Amino acid sequence: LGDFGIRLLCVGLKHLLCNLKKLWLVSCCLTSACCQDLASVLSTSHSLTRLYVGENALGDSGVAILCEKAKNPQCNLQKLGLVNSGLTSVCCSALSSVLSTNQNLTHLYLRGNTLGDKGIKLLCEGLLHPDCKLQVLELDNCNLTSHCCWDLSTLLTSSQSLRKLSLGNNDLGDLGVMMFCEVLKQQSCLLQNLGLSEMYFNYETKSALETLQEEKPELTVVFEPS
Amino acid sequence: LGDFGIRLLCVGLKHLLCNLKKLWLVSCCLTSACCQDLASVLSTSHSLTRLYVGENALGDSGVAILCEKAKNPQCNLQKLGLVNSGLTSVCCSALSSVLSTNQNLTHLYLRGNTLGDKGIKLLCEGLLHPDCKLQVLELDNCNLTSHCCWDLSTLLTSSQSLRKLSLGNNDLGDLGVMMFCEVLKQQSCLLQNLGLSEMYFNYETKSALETLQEEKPELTVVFEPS
């Protein structure tokens, strides 16, 4: 269902009496060209809350379009599946704007996007905003490294809305993770799965993670690979 | 004084009654080809203790040659200036062998060599050896990152011979440095300049470094850039 298919599909999505709530357009050979129509659906639709458009060519220039309308505080978007969209840090300022302004957005899935450390810093500007209500943030293969741990650490204790943070298959660094343990103990509200899957650590780090689960029993799970 | 010049120079260096102790061949348009002759000088010379051959094309394949003779426990080499020699982690196993076996080697200067984290791991195998007597190790622009901090941390407290460690212009990470502070306090003998020059840190890290100097007064200096 390439870009043209979306132009046609959006005819129904923007239509009155269209009560569709969840729409998956994952891997539909889409490009940023279709974002102009999807953005309109997000703006006008009274019912669409779950939009999954990852595994597409909706790169930074595409997300910026979706964000221009998704940032509207009256938008009903709750879950945004911009997974393997080929995003870079370039559009994280747009995602940040949406996170900051759109109080209805509770789940954002960015895995597969090579956002790097710059992207995390930009997202944090929104995530740490008092009006951000994001609960679940997924950051697996996002090409992150240890230099972003200070910003992720900030989110772990400073974001009062965040509940889950699915860090994953990226070379984050085991030392960085040990820092997370120390800060999470400081009354963090991040009680859901912390990810860190497919991420390997030395002994001291693994010990720290096991300790965290015991010392902070309100935490659902670390979910180490071994 | 290219490789040929060295072949001629070594005639005097290998000669009896040649009491030369310090020789600088820095930036002399040398390649690994000359190492065959320099290595012979190191093996036979009764007086040469200071050999500086950096800023040359004496890459990994060149160092391996020098190491083959410098590793000899009867070698009089004390300072080895393999600075900007264009070395990679490939020859660090050779340098490790020298550090482990040659008890007369007290200063090793590797700045400018893109050794990376793999190089540090390999050097540590030698540096942490009970027979290693190295006192000064220079690692400035060595293309290191935060993933080597566990091995450097081990070096900081486990090597009883090391006195100075000139970490420098590399993106080591400020979190990594904070770890160094914590371990140095554990009766480290590394009381000389810790380098970390031209390396910029966040507030918490700078505070930790200033604290280290106050809490561990036997430490000569951290030497932060600001």
UniProtKB/Swiss-Prot annotation, chains A, B:
The modification Phosphotyrosine is found at Y52. Ubiquitinated; undergoes both 'Lys-48'- and 'Lys-63'-linked polyubiquitination. Ubiquitination does not lead to degradation, but inhibits inflammasome activation. Deubiquitination is catalyzed by BRCC3 and associated with NLRP3 activation and inflammasome assembly. This process can be induced by the activation of Toll-like receptors (by LPS), through a non-transcriptional pathway dependent on the mitochondrial production of reactive oxygen species, and by ATP. Ubiquitinated by TRIM31 via 'Lys-48'-linked ubiquitination, leading to its degradation by the proteasome. Palmitoylation by ZDHHC12 promotes NLRP3 degradation by the chaperone-mediated autophagy pathway (CMA) and therefore limits NLRP3 inflammasome activation. Following palmitoylation, HSPA8/HSC70 recognizes and binds the KFERQ-like motifs on NLRP3 and promotes NLRP3 recruitment to lysosomes, where it is degraded via the chaperone-mediated autophagy pathway in a LAMP2-dependent process. Palmitoylation at Cys-28 and Cys-29 by ZDHHC5 enhances its binding to NEK7 leading to inflammasome assembly and activation. It is found in: Cytoplasm, Cytosol; Inflammasome; Cytoplasm, Cytoskeleton, Microtubule organizing center; Golgi apparatus membrane. Changing C149A: Decreased palmitoylation and activation of the NLRP3 inflammasome. Induction: By activators of Toll-like receptors, such as lipoteichoic acid (LTA) (TLR2), polyinosine-polycytidylic acid (poly(I:C), a synthetic analog of dsRNA) (TLR3) and bacterial lipopolysaccharides (LPS) (TLR4), and by TNF. Up-regulated in osteoblasts after exposure to invasive, but not invasion-defective, strains of Salmonella typhimurium (at protein level). In macrophages, up-regulated by endocannabinoid anandamide/AEA. A lipid is attached at C28, C29, C35, C149 (S-palmitoyl cysteine). Changing S226A: Does not affect activation of the NLRP3 inflammasome. The modification Phosphoserine is found at S166, S226. There is a cross-link at K69, K118, K164 (Glycyl lysine isopeptide (Lys-Gly) (interchain with G-Cter in ubiquitin)). LRR repeats lie at residues 19-40, 47-67, 76-97, 104-124, 133-154, 161-182. Changing Y52F: Abolished phosphorylation. A motif (KFERQ-like motif 4) lies at residues 182-186. Predominantly expressed in macrophages. Also expressed in dendritic cells, B- and T-cells (at protein level). Expressed in LPS-treated granulocytes, but not in resting cells (at protein level). Expression in monocytes is very weak (at protein level). Expressed in stratified non-keratinizing squamous epithelium, including oral, esophageal and ectocervical mucosa and in the Hassall's corpuscles in the thymus. Also, detected in the stratified epithelium covering the bladder and ureter (transitional mucosa) (at protein level). Expressed in lung epithelial cells (at protein level). The pyrin domain (also called DAPIN domain or PYD) is involved in PYCARD/ASC-binding. The FISNA domain is a critical mediator of NLRP3 conformational during NLRP3 activation. It becomes ordered in its key regions during activation to stabilize the active NACHT conformation and mediate most interactions in the NLRP3 disk. It is linked to Familial cold autoinflammatory syndrome 1: A rare autosomal dominant systemic inflammatory disease characterized by recurrent episodes of maculopapular rash associated with arthralgias, myalgias, fever and chills, swelling of the extremities, and conjunctivitis after generalized exposure to cold. Rarely, some patients may also develop late-onset renal amyloidosis. Muckle-Wells syndrome: A hereditary periodic fever syndrome characterized by fever, chronic recurrent urticaria, arthralgias, progressive sensorineural deafness, and reactive renal amyloidosis. The disease may be severe if generalized reactive amyloidosis occurs. Belongs to the NLRP family. Sensor component of the NLRP3 inflammasome, which mediates inflammasome activation in response to defects in membrane integrity, leading to secretion of inflammatory cytokines IL1B and IL18 and pyroptosis. In response to pathogens and other damage-associated signals that affect the integrity of membranes, initiates the formation of the inflammasome polymeric complex composed of NLRP3, CASP1 and PYCARD/ASC. Independently of inflammasome activation, regulates the differentiation of T helper 2 (Th2) cells and has a role in Th2 cell-dependent asthma and tumor growth. During Th2 differentiation, required for optimal IRF4 binding to IL4 promoter and for IRF4-dependent IL4 transcription. Binds to the consensus DNA sequence 5'-GRRGGNRGAG-3'. May also participate in the transcription of IL5, IL13, GATA3, CCR3, CCR4 and MAF. This is NACHT, LRR and PYD domains-containing protein 3. The gene is NLRP3.
